Amino acid sequence: DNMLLVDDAINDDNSVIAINSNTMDKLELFRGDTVLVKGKKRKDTVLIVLIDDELEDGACRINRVVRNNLRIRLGDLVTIHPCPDIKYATRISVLPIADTIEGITGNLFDVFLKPYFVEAYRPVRKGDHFVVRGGMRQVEFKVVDVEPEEYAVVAQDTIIHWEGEPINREDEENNMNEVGYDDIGGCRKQMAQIREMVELPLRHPQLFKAIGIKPPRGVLMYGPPGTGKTLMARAVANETGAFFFLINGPEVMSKMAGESESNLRKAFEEAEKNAPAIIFIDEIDSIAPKRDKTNGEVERRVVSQLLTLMDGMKARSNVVVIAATNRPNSIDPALRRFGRFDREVDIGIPDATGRLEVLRIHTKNMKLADDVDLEALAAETHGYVGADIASLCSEAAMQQIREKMDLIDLDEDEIDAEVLDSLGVTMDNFRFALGNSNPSALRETVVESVNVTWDDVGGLDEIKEELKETVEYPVLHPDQYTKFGLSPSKGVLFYGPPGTGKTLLAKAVATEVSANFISVKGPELLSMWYGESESNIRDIFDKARAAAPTVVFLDELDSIAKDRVVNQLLTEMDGMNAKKNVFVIGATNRPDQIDPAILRPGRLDQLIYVPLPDENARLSILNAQLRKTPLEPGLELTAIAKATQGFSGADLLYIVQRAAKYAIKDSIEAHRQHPVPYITKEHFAEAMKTAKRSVSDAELRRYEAYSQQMKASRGQ
Amino acid sequence: LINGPEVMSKMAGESESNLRKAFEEAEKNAPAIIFIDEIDSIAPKRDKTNGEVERRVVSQLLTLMDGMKARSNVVVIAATNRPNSIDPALRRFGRFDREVDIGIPDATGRLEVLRIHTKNMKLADDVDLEALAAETHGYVGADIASLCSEAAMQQIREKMDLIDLDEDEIDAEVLDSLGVTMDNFRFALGNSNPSALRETVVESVNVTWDDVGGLDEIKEELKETVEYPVLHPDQYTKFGLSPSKGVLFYGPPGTGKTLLAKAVATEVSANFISVKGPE
Amino acid sequence: RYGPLRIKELAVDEELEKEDGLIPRQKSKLCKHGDRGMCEYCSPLPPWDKEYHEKNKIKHISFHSYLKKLNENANKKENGSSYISPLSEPDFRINKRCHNGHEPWPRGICSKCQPSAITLQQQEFRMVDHVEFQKSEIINEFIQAWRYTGMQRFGYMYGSYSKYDNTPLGIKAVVEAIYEPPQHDEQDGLTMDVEQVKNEMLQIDRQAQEMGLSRIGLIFTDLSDAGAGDGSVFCKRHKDSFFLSSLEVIMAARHQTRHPNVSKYSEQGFFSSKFVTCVISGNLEGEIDISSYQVSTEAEALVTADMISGSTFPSMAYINDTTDERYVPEIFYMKSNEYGITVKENAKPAFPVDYLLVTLTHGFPNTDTETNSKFVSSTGFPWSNRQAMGQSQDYQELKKYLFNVASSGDFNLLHEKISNFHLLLYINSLQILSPDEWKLLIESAVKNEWEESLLKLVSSAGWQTLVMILQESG
Ligand SMILES: Nc1ncnc2c1ncn2[C@@H]1O[C@H](COP(=O)(O)OP(=O)(O)O)[C@@H](O)[C@H]1O
Numbered sequence A: 001d002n003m004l005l006v007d008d009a010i011n012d013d014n015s016v017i018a019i020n021s022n023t024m025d026k027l028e029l030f031r032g033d034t035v036l037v038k039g040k041k042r043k044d045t046v047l048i049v050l051i052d053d054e055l056e057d058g059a060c061r062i063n064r065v066v067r068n069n070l071r072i073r074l075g076d077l078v079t080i081h082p083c084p085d086i087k088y089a090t091r092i093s094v095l096p097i098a099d100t101i102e103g104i105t106g107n108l109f110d111v112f113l114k115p116y117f118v119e120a121y122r123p124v125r126k127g128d129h130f131v132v133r134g135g136m137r138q139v140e141f142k143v144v145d146v147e148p149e150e151y152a153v154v155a156q157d158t159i160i161h162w163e164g165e166p167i168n169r170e171d172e173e174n175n176m177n178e179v180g181y182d183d184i185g186g187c188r189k190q191m192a193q194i195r196e197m198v199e200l201p202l203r204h205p206q207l208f209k210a211i212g213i214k215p216p217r218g219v220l221m222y223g224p225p226g227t228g229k230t231l232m233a234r235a236v237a238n239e240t241g242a243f244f245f246l247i248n249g250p251e252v253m254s255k256m257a258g259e260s261e262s263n264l265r266k267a268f269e270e271a272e273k274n275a276p277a278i279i280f281i282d283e284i285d286s287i288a289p290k291r292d293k294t295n296g297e298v299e300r301r302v303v304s305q306l307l308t309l310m311d312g313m314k315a316r317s318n319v320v321v322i323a324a325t326n327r328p329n330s331i332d333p334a335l336r337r338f339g340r341f342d343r344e345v346d347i348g349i350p351d352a353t354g355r356l357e358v359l360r361i362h363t364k365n366m367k368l369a370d371d372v373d374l375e376a377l378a379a380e381t382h383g384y385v386g387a388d389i390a391s392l393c394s395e396a397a398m399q400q401i402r403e404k405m406d407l408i409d410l411d412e413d414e415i416d417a418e419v420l421d422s423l424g425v426t427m428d429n430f431r432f433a434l435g436n437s438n439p440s441a442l443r444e445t446v447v448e449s450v451n452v453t454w455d456d457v458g459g460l461d462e463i464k465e466e467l468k469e470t471v472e473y474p475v476l477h478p479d480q481y482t483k484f485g486l487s488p489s490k491g492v493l494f495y496g497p498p499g500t501g502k503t504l505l506a507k508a509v510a511t512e513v514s515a516n517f518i519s520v521k522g523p524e525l526l527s528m529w530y531g532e533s534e535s536n537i538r539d540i541f542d543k544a545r546a547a548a549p550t551v552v553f554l555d556e557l558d559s560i561a562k563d564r565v566v567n568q569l570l571t572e573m574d575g576m577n578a579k580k581n582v583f584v585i586g587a588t589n590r591p592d593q594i595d596p597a598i599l600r601p602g603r604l605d606q607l608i609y610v611p612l613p614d615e616n617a618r619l620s621i622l623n624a625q626l627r628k629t630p631l632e633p634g635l636e637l638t639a640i641a642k643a644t645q646g647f648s649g650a651d652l653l654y655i656v657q658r659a660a661k662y663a664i665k666d667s668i669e670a671h672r673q674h675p676v677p678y679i680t681k682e683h684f685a686e687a688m689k690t691a692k693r694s695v696s697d698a699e700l701r702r703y704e705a706y707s708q709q710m711k712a713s714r715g716q
Numbered sequence B: 001l002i003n004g005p006e007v008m009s010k011m012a013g014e015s016e017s018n019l020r021k022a023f024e025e026a027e028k029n030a031p032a033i034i035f036i037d038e039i040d041s042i043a044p045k046r047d048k049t050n051g052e053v054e055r056r057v058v059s060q061l062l063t064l065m066d067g068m069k070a071r072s073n074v075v076v077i078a079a080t081n082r083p084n085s086i087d088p089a090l091r092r093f094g095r096f097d098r099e100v101d102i103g104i105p106d107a108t109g110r111l112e113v114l115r116i117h118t119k120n121m122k123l124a125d126d127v128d129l130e131a132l133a134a135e136t137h138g139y140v141g142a143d144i145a146s147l148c149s150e151a152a153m154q155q156i157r158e159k160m161d162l163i164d165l166d167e168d169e170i171d172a173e174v175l176d177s178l179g180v181t182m183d184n185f186r187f188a189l190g191n192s193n194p195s196a197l198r199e200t201v202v203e204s205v206n207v208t209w210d211d212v213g214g215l216d217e218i219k220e221e222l223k224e225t226v227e228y229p230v231l232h233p234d235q236y237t238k239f240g241l242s243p244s245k246g247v248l249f250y251g252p253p254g255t256g257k258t259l260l261a262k263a264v265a266t267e268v269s270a271n272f273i274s275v276k277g278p279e
Numbered sequence C: 001r002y003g004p005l006r007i008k009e010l011a012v013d014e015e016l017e018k019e020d021g022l023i024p025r026q027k028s029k030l031c032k033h034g035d036r037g038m039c040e041y042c043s044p045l046p047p048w049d050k051e052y053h054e055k056n057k058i059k060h061i062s063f064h065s066y067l068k069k070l071n072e073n074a075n076k077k078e079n080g081s082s083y084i085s086p087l088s089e090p091d092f093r094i095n096k097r098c099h100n101g102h103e104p105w106p107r108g109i110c111s112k113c114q115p116s117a118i119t120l121q122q123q124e125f126r127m128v129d130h131v132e133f134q135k136s137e138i139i140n141e142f143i144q145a146w147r148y149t150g151m152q153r154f155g156y157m158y159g160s161y162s163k164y165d166n167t168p169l170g171i172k173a174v175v176e177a178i179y180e181p182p183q184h185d186e187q188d189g190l191t192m193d194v195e196q197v198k199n200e201m202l203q204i205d206r207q208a209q210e211m212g213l214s215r216i217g218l219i220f221t222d223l224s225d226a227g228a229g230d231g232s233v234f235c236k237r238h239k240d241s242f243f244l245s246s247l248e249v250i251m252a253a254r255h256q257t258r259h260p261n262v263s264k265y266s267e268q269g270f271f272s273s274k275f276v277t278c279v280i281s282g283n284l285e286g287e288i289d290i291s292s293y294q295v296s297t298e299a300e301a302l303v304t305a306d307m308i309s310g311s312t313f314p315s316m317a318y319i320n321d322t323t324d325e326r327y328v329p330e331i332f333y334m335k336s337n338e339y340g341i342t343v344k345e346n347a348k349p350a351f352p353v354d355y356l357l358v359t360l361t362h363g364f365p366n367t368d369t370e371t372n373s374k375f376v377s378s379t380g381f382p383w384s385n386r387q388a389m390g391q392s393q394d395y396q397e398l399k400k401y402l403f404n405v406a407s408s409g410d411f412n413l414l415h416e417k418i419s420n421f422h423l424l425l426y427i428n429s430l431q432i433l434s435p436d437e438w439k440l441l442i443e444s445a446v447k448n449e450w451e452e453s454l455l456k457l458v459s460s461a462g463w464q465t466l467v468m469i470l471q472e473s474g
């Protein structure tokens, strides 16, 4: 109907749109009609309709300036509606762009605008752009202000105020707010959650009146720093079109005593007075830290004022409060109950596709060279948040500048445009930037996604089926459990010799049910025990709840399970709701050393043995670790697998690594002497000559004895 | 009405004059009721706060409370989650002496709460609020309200397929077709997460001498120990013998000691408080 | 409104806002850096720097500079907010409708709609800085009123505002003429029905606006004669005594509340009326020195909700009692001791008014500069409401005053006699002249380049009738 296709208009007029005759008949439009056109980002404009049969039915033509104003590209769909109630502009104040007006003498108004508006009746709306082509020059302008507001028709008698200081162009670009969803990638799940939690209360309030419920108000986002929380909040606010009222934490806390409270009160009052609105309290942890932190009165009055304001807004006002904190435990506990920030959202490091999306988003203004393999960079960047990727791009560009610096005269302040053209980033530059990268997200526990199937784990079919029936069935067929009245099992404990690949089994289990994975290695547990860490077990389980369905993994639990930490872990495990799809998987090498309390029913009761890989399993592991390596044609690893009886997966990795080391040594020696694109069987034999088992016979016998004891304990 | 944080957020020297004027006005227009919500924030434990203002406020509160005790028909009510958090000096004669304990509701209480909250929602015919009340255990009223809100949100999310978000308004038929199904409530139960049980709370139990097996002599001994003092204190006074205080169960694990304790509590119709090992 | 409010205000405010007022400073001898690059002592001094004001013997900070300080203190550009109005006039009246669950104040109140304790403190910014009397005659005639009658007086003072270079971003109110409302003056005080005063002043101010003036304050004389041989007067208003007793402060606060100043930086659009009150008391010697004052903004918003009344002690203002429709919270007045520590003293029975005032600097135009006085007049046709004295406006005085000049010519002499404020008001009162004829009359009498307009005026039949009836009348 009104979803007209966008196309480039022949005319250069800034307020003229050509439409097809068929569409004109459908919409009952006519030549010269002023119509309101809406595109994307809620952008709107006023265009004079002109019949044009050249366009295909259902298509319209607009010029470059109108498309730029509408923030839309050719081929999109725009909605055109009648605008019969547009009045003549009583007074329009307009200012030019400085860079455009450079080199112009005389009165700009007479030169450009006076012929442009006389006998033109061009509709003008605030925030629009119009370009005047006079003589040999072309100058753009802005619709700074219109009376009556917000738009009106510039008639012959309309007064135009061109007086005013030039407007810098840098503000429009470098201040690129109004960022849409297209500027956020790799976090579609959390973006969808925030959208479904914010848009519907504001865009369609009548829904909840029809259902007769009070929609949730508070929202609390948290995650590692640099994951785009502020960017997501800004994008949601801009798309929703609400009265955004960004509030910073450090900014509020930097005011004199007795002023931060006033700022908070004024902010909340203005947000209420202009409903609907969206208040974003950035870095709330800087306003209301944990109780054990600063006890100063100035640090308590602000928290009390914030609590009072949060409790006082419960009314028919459309106010939504969004807060961002690095960790959930930093905020005062009082801010996590009903009527307050009761809804939580967790941001985690992206996967390969997310990193690719981030790279493409950032690497659209770069003058990249042809040899770009963004997929390769995404594969080789693990654990990078968006900020790290942006820094990587900046460093790569700086490296390219350094490389091209040879053709630059530093003393001279002007650089040849030819040299500027030659600038282009290359894959080597990105590799160097990675070499100079300093990721820091992984220093703490963070939600992440894994993509391991039942192919990187060789053999162990019975274990695979046991894990499937333990985990996958509850998630996919909970209705059956309800029908039979059986509560799903919470977690399991993997025990066995080191290197059996327990982490791989955990990752596979997480992948099958499409669940986020959280890892807690031994050093993290020790740091928590000493109390010098930035996070605590309660925080870990809160994040697990927030990012459900999650899978928490503990490694070498025997170090702490040899106790305050174990008590906290038991309390948290008992606390969690059974229905929540949260699974705690523990890995250890000395099960008998584990505290018996951990093994009680209702806890990590199920005990699963992870045996060493067998011949076929070893062959599969070797083939898997060598899939992306150039091997000798006609080479067979069956003999090597047969000869490696009793070796663990880590041992096979070590053998392959030594073979690769010998291959690279030989290749480098040959190149220096100057061939060997692959690895010959002699390298594998040399590597195997140094093979050494990582498991002693006594320990394996002890594991077998423990397994036999466990089987006897269940054999009657 | 006086709030804790609301008074605490005032400038220095103004959080006490407000209390003074509050009490004076309450006296002027008797009968009056004063609800000092979140009294802990303005009177925490003595060790928690050492600042001068945090003691000026408490002293002013105590002086006003002592001066209020008179013919005036004014009653003071205070609320605080932790009974020990309040300054101990506030719990003497002539002050907040009478104490009331609020415990998590039972199945009947949960049913009543659900009915009270679920009176306006467009509930579908296939709703079994009794089943929800039975399943929800340890859910405080706030948790139940959140559960209902989440279920309604899930229902609207499911119906979103036919809803065009771009249009400001929606077809009236779709708006009038919203209906909450039992599956939505089950999903909300799955999502929800109560937190009352994290700390010790008072709750009732309904275990009789039929969910346990055997132990007939033990049951008789427990009855003689607890029931008779509660049901027939008159005869105990007649003989002048005070009842025994406590009892200690010992034996192999998994024999059902918790069920015996719950049954004993139910027989005397007394509230049950528990303290697990981790606590 | 996604930014600063949109409204049109006085030209003085606009031009002052355009400036920034930075006071440049040169290389200090303590700097350690090359020629370019300023470290900490060479930076420009902001216009609100209190050190400069107190070092130059200026007691207040030229309100516009205070606005600049407030704007700089917050409201980061391009981000950090969506604009918060920096100026807000305090209001003490209890919110009649809060309803968190309680009923209106008369029978119910919560802690959210309870007027918090008021901390009285001397204001630091004075709206209008310098009050300037164009000519000595304007006030000499006023004092001559007291000389002749012996009773006190009271009169509004019309004029216009302009810049004041001598102070950073300062404003000066130049007073052009004085109009005396009908009042019943007496030895110890004066009285006047408010209804008549406002009814008369409405039309008088309409005519003044037509003439280009504006009501910019009230002036009253508190003078007593001494026992010396000549005319000497006691100095009853000094540091020890009361500068302004309670009642005058109350009246000034009411007047300010009823003459709001339109501003672009408040939610309501008004803040701290630019109204100046002048009192004549006499300096430490026997002279007849004048003074100026202005009640602070808190006192402006304090009298509106009653809460203040006069006290038998001249220097202290009584405080009223709580009652329905009037809630009065505890009032703490903050002072400073000799040890540099602020002390809060509760003063319920009564407190001094020294904390509710800001003092302005009176003066007269330099006697060696261009003369831009609207009216070269005020020694002639007697002023309006001097019925108590012999002065009385009527046909006979016009015949004696403005007949021989018109009957012959000499337009140069005529112009000054036609540029008298009260003369214009009286002739307009007669209603003899037609509207447009009166408009061109005022345009000739209050503007330069008046030859053609004056000739046209004397041409119009209205003036011919005026002169004819004047001559015919005794
Ligand atoms: N999709 C994205 N996810 C994460 N970061 C992104 C994304 N797109 C861009 N970025 C960049 O990552 C950074 C995110 O900053 P952010 O962590 O939100 O700031 P804050 O510290 O205020 O939370 C910015 O430099 C932003 O440009």
Ligand SMILES: Nc1ncnc2c1ncn2[C@@H]1O[C@H](COP(=O)(O)OP(=O)(O)O)[C@@H](O)[C@H]1O
Binding pocket: A456, A457, A458, A497, A498, A499, A500, A501, A502, A503, A504, A613, A617, A621, A648, A649, A650, A653
């Ligand atoms: N099917 C498999 N069985 C055992 N190990 C494997 C298998 N597939 C891969 N591996 C390798 O085993 C290693 C396990 O490392 P590590 O975590 O230190 O020991 P574990 O996983 O046994 O705790 C991984 O680096 C991985 O490359």
Ligand SMILES: Nc1ncnc2c1ncn2[C@@H]1O[C@H](COP(=O)(O)OP(=O)(O)O)[C@@H](O)[C@H]1O
Binding pocket: B211, B212, B213, B214, B253, B254, B255, B256, B257, B258, B259
């Ligand atoms: N008569 C009984 N004897 C033993 N166990 C029972 C009996 N009745 C119920 N149970 C079961 O015992 C479990 C709780 O055992 P209990 O002894 O109360 O706690 P614990 O095992 O910690 O001592 C419950 O899951 C319940 O199903």
Ligand SMILES: [Zn+2]
Binding pocket: C027, C028, C031, C032, C033, C037, C038, C039, C040, C041, C042
């Ligand atoms: Zn310097």
Ligand SMILES: [Zn+2]
Binding pocket: C098, C099, C100, C102, C109, C110, C111, C112, C113, C114
């Ligand atoms: Zn109220």
